[PDB]
C-alpha cells in the first residue's frame, strides 16, 4: 500500500534517511523499520526542480501522477524520466491502496511539488485516505487516530529517549492540562492543547515521561522551556493558535500538566534557516516576554557551555546609559496620560495614545538612537553575539549590521507584564512603554520565536546523549607581531600571535580531517584591540551555511587570545587584519 508524502517544513533532506525525517520512530525498532520501502530517489528532486518554473500547479500533478513506482529509463544520454509499504514523493492516484500522509503542519516552500498539497488534501477528504503519522506504526493501516483494536501502548508510541548535528528530533506533543484537582480527589475535566515542534532532547534531558500528571505552578522551567523553543501551541483537534498565560491570569489556573500522546515526531533541519550569519542575531520579542528563562535558566540546568554571558545582549541595555527618563517626559500631561494608558489595555485606540507615543517617539530619537549607534561593536563584533531588541526599528534606526529575526512568543506577555514586581515606575508604565515599543514594529510577520531557539539552543540539547566526548576546534585569526609593538604595546618573543575568533565542537574528529587548516577566507576577519577588549569584524560576513554540519558552535562567544600570557603591558590601541583557519 503506497503512501504519498509531500515534505513538511524544514524537512531534513541531507544526512538523515527519509524515514528519520517523515516521522521518526518509524526507524526506531528493526521490527518496524523493515516494513517501509522508501522511494524518494535522488534524481527526482533535481529533475523536477528545473521544470517547476513553468509547469502549472495542476498541470504538473497530472503529468506526474500517472507513473509506476520503479520507473524505467529514457532517451539518449540517460535522463531518468520526469515489501509491505511503499513511501513515495510521487503523488499517485490516491485510491484504496494509496494514502496521503498528513503531518498536521505547514508544507515547506522549497519543495517544487508542494503546490500539489491543497489539491491532494481536498481529494483525500472526499474519500477517507487522509493518513495521520501515528498510523504508520501499527500492523494495519487505519486512517483514524486511537482506533478500536489497538490500545496504543507499544514502546514506539512514546516518541522519547531518542556528526549528529544540524538535525534535531522534534515532537508536536499534545498535552492535557487539567485544572484544580479539588472536590474529594475527582478532577475537573480541563482542556488539552498541542505544542508544536518541541525538541525531543529538551523533554528527554528533563526526564519527562509520556503519561504522568506533572505539577505546573511551582510555571515550571521544563514547560517554560518547551513553550519557548516550541514553535506554536494550538488548541488540540482544531487549528486555533492560543497564547498561554503564566501569571494570576484567570481562575482555574491549570495546576497540572501531563503530556498525553506524541502526534508526529519528526526530525527537522535547522542548518541556517532563521540565523543566517555566524556573527550576531537579534530577536524583536515584546516587552513582557520570557528573555530571562532562556538566557540563563536553560544554561543553568546544564554544566556544559551553550552560552557566555559577556555577550547575550539583553533588551533594555540601552537603559544602561531611560525608563525614569520617559516617565520624566510625561508627568506634565495629566488625564491624557492616565486616559491614554487605558486605550493600550482596551481593544480600541483613542487620541490620548497619540500624545503619549509622540512624547515617546520624539524622545527615542534623541537619546537612544545615539546610544545605539555608539553601541556598534558590542552588538555585532564581539566574536559571536546574540541580541535582544523590542523592535526592528531599535536596531535599524541606528545602522547596526545584524540580521533582525522577528519574534512572537506563544505566551501572552501583557498579562505577564501586569504581574511585574518591583519595577521602575508602576506596572502601567510598562504598558505605556510596551505599546510604544509595539507601534514601531513595522508590520512584518512575526516569525515564531521557537524557530530560532531550535537552532541556537537547539543542537546543545543533543549534547548530553552523544555518548562521545567533545572535540574543541577553533576558528583562529593570526596577528603579525610588530603591529602590536608599533602601537605602544609589548609582546613576548616577537612571534605571530593567534586570536581565536570562534570556537566550535566537532564530535568525532570529522571537521579536522577536511576542515582543519583549510583557510576558508571568504569572510576575511579584522580584530581591533583596545583598552581591555578585542572586537572581531568579518569583512566578508561568515555565513552559517558554510559551517559544515556537526560543527556545533556555541552561542555568544567572546574573543580570547590563544596565549594571553604572551601579551605584556596591554600597550596601545590599534586594528590589524588577518585570514583565519580552523584547528
Amino acid at each position: 500500500i503506497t503512501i504519498v508524502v509531500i515534505p513538511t517544513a524544514h524537512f531534513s533532506w541531507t544526512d538523515t534517511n527519509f524515514l528519520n525525517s517523515v516521522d521518526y520512530r518509524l526507524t526506531s525498532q528493526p521490527k518496524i523499520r523493515d516494513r517501509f520501502a522508501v522511494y524518494a530517489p535522488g534524481w527526482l528532486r533535481r529533475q523536477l526542480d528545473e521544470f517547476s518554473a513553468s509547469l502549472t500547479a495542476s498541470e504538473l500533478l497530472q503529468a506526474l501522477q500517472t507513473i509506476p513506482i520503479p520507473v524505467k529509463a529514457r532517451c539518449l544520454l540517460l535522463p531518468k524520466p520526469k515489501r509491505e509499504f511503499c513511501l513515495t514523493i510521487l503523488p499517485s492516484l490516491l485510491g484504496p491502496r494509496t494514502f496521503l500522509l498528513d503531518v498536521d503542519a505547514d508544507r515547506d516552500a522549497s519543495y517544487p511539488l508542494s503546490v500539489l498539497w491543497p489539491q491532494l488534501r481536498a481529494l483525500a477528504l472526499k474519500s477517507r485516505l487522509l493518513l495521520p503519522p501515528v498510523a504508520l506504526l501499527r500492523r494495519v493501516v487505519d486512517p483514524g487516530l486511537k482506533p478500536t483494536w489497538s490500545a496504543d501502548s507499544d514502546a514506539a508510541f512514546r516518541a522519547l529517549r531518542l556528526f549528529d548535528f544540524s538535525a534535531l528530533p522534534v515532537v508536536d506533543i499534545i498535552c492535557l492540562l487539567e485544572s484544580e484537582p479539588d472536590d474529594h480527589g475527582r478532577i475537573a475535566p480541563g482542556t488539552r492543547l498541542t505544542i508544536h515542534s518541541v525538541p525531543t532532547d529538551l523533554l528527554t534531558s528533563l526526564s519527562i515521561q509520556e503519561g504522568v500528571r506533572y505539577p505546573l505552578r511551582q510555571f515550571v522551567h521544563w514547560v517554560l522551556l518547551a513553550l519557548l523553543m516550541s514553535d506554536d501551541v494550538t488548541i488540540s483537534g482544531t487549528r486555533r493558535s492560543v497564547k498561554l498565560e503564566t501569571a494570576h491570569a484567570s481562575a482555574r489556573p491549570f495546576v497540572h500538566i501531563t503530556v498525553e500522546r506524541c502526534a508526529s515526531a519528526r526530525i527537522i533541519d535547522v542548518r541556517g534557516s532563521p540565523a543566517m550569519y555566524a556573527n550576531a542575531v537579534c530577536l524583536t520579542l515584546p516587552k513582557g516576554s520570557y528573555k530571562s528563562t532562556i538566557i540563563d535558566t536553560l544554561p543553568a540546568m546544564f554544566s556544559d557551555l551553550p552560552i557566555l554571558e559577556q555577550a547575550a545582549v539583553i533588551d533594555s541595555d540601552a537603559l544602561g546609559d531611560f525608563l525614569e527618563r520617559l516617565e520624566n517626559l510625561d508627568p506634565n500631561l495629566l488625564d491624557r496620560a492616565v486616559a491614554s494608558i487605558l486605550s493600550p489595555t482596551s481593544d480600541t485606540s483613542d487620541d490620548a495614545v497619540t500624545t503619549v507615543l509622540d512624547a515617546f517617539n520624539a524622545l527615542y530619537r534623541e537619546i537612544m538612537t545615539p546610544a545605539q549607534r555608539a553601541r556598534l561593536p558590542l552588538l555585532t563584533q564581539q566574536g559571536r553575539v546574540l541580541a535582544f531588541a523590542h523592535s526592528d526599528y531599535e536596531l535599524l534606526s541606528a545602522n547596526i549590521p545584524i540580521q533582525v529575526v522577528r519574534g512572537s512568543i506563544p505566551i501572552d506577555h501583557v498579562v505577564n507584564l501586569l504581574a511585574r514586581r518591583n519595577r521602575v515606575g508602576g506596572t502601567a508604565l510598562q504598558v505605556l512603554l510596551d505599546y510604544c515599543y509595539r507601534t514601531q514594529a513595522s508590520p512584518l510577520a512575526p516569525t515564531p520565536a521557537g524557530r530560532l531557539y531550535k537552532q541556537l539552543f537547539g543542537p546543545w540539547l543533543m549534547v548530553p546523549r552523544l555518548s562521545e566526548p567533545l572535540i574543541k576546534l577553533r576558528l583562529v585569526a593570526s596577528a603579525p607581531a610588530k603591529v602590536l609593538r608599533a602601537a605602544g604595546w609589548t609582546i613576548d618573543g616577537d612571534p605571530p600571535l593567534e586570536v581565536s575568533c570562534l570556537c566550535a565542537y566537532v564530535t568525532d574528529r570529522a571537521a579536522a580531517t577536511a576542515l582543519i587548516e583549510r583557510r576558508l577566507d571568504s569572510r576575511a576577519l579584522v580584530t581591533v584591540g583596545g583598552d581591555q577588549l578585542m572586537f572581531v569584524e568579518y569583512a566578508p560576513p561568515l555565513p552559517l551555511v558554510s559551517i559544515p554540519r556537526t560543527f556545533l558552535l556555541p552561542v555568544t562567544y567572546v574573543v580570547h587570545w590563544v596565549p594571553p600570557q604572551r601579551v605584556l603591558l596591554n600597550g596601545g590601541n590599534v586594528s590589524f587584519t588577518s585570514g583565519l583557519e580552523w584547528t
Binding site: 526542480d49 498539497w117 491543497p118 517617539n361 510577520a445 569583512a539 551555511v545
Partner: protein
C-alpha cells in the same frame, strides 16, 4: 520622523510575510494602499509580460546598459546557497560587472527558486537577482507613472508656469530616498501589491519564479495553506528584503582602511517618483478641503 504612524491593530493577521491593511483605516495610508492595490490588480491580469521578447527586454533592464555600480560578487554571498557560479574558461577581464553577475548565474532564467539567498548582501556601492526579485515593484510603479523630454516637456512648461497670470507653488521633496521606509511607506506598498496580485491566476508563475504556497494566518479561527501566484512569491521576498533594509559594503578609496557593512532603508528606482502623484492626489481632494 512620522507624526502619524499606522497603529499595529490596523493590519490583518499575517499571510506568510506581508500583511494586509484593514478596510477601516482611512487617511493618507488608505489612498496609498488603494492606488497601489488597484494598479497591482491590473498588472497581474495582462498579456504584455508573457511574451518572450518582453522578458528579454526586462532582463536587459537589470544588467544596466548605462550606469551600474561596484557590486561585490556572488559566490562569497552564495556560500549561503549551494549554487556554484560560473568561472572563466579563458583569462577573464571583466570584474563583477553587472553583466557578469548575469553571466555568473544564468542557468535558470537569470534566477532559480534554488536561489532564495538573494537577501545576504545587497546594493553594493560606495545585484541582478535583487533587481529581478524587484520585478513586480517597478512593474506596478510603471503603471502609476503612466502620465510621467526636457526640451519639450519641461522647458515649455517651466515657461508656462512662470507667467504672471498663474501663481505657481513648486514642491521639492528633500530626501525622497530616505523617506521610503518599511515602517509606513514600503509596507503599505508590499501589502497592496500582494492583495492586487490575487486577481491573476493563483497558480501562474511569473518571470521564472514558481507559485509556492503560504501560511495565511489572517483569520484566527481558520488558518489554511494557500497557493499564491508567482508574482506574490516575489512580494514575500521583497517584504523579507525591504524590512531588513539594504546592505551597503562601502569601502572608500579616499580613506585608507575604511571598510564597512552598512544597513539602511535608502535606495541610491522609480517608486519614490511614483508615490509623489498619489500622495498629492490625496492632498488636493481629501486633506486640504478637510481643513484650511
Amino acid at each position: 520622523d512620522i507624526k502619524d504612524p499606522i497603529p499595529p491593530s490596523a493590519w490583518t493577521g499575517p499571510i506568510g510575510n506581508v500583511r494586509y491593511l484593514l478596510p477601516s483605516v482611512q487617511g493618507p495610508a488608505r489612498h496609498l494602499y488603494d492606488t497601489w492595490r488597484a494598479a497591482a490588480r491590473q498588472i497581474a491580469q495582462d498579456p504584455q509580460w508573457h511574451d518572450p521578447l518582453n522578458q528579454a527586454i526586462m532582463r536587459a533592464q537589470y544588467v544596466t546598459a548605462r550606469g551600474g555600480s561596484s557590486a561585490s560578487l556572488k559566490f562569497a554571498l552564495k556560500v549561503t546557497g549551494i549554487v556554484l557560479p560560473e568561472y572563466d574558461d579563458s583569462k577573464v577581464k571583466k570584474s563583477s560587472k553587472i553583466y557578469q553577475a548575469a553571466q555568473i548565474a544564468r542557468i535558470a532564467f537569470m534566477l532559480l527558486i534554488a536561489a532564495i539567498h538573494a537577501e545576504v548582501t545587497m546594493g553594493i556601492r560606495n545585484n541582478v537577482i535583487q533587481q529581478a526579485i524587484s520585478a513586480p515593484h517597478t512593474l506596478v510603479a510603471n503603471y502609476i507613472n503612466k502620465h510621467m523630454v526636457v526640451t519639450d516637456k519641461v522647458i515649455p512648461l517651466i515657461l508656462y508656469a512662470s507667467t504672471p497670470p498663474n501663481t505657481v507653488v513648486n514642491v521639492d521633496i528633500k530626501a525622497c530616498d530616505a523617506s521610503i521606509t518599511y515602517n509606513y511607506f514600503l509596507s503599505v506598498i508590499c501589502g497592496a501589491m500582494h492583495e492586487g496580485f490575487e486577481v491573476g491566476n493563483a497558480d501562474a508563475a511569473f518571470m521564472g519564479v514558481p507559485s509556492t504556497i503560504v501560511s495565511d494566518r489572517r483569520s484566527p479561527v481558520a488558518p489554511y495553506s494557500r497557493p499564491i501566484s508567482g508574482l506574490q512569491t516575489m512580494v514575500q521576498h521583497l517584504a523579507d528584503l525591504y524590512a531588513a533594509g539594504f546592505r551597503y559594503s562601502v569601502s572608500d578609496a579616499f580613506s585608507s582602511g575604511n571598510k564597512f557593512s552598512f544597513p539602511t532603508s535608502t535606495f541610491p528606482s522609480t517608486e519614490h517618483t511614483a508615490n509623489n502623484s498619489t500622495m498629492m492626489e490625496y492632498f488636493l481632494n481629501v486633506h486640504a478641503p478637510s481643513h484650511v
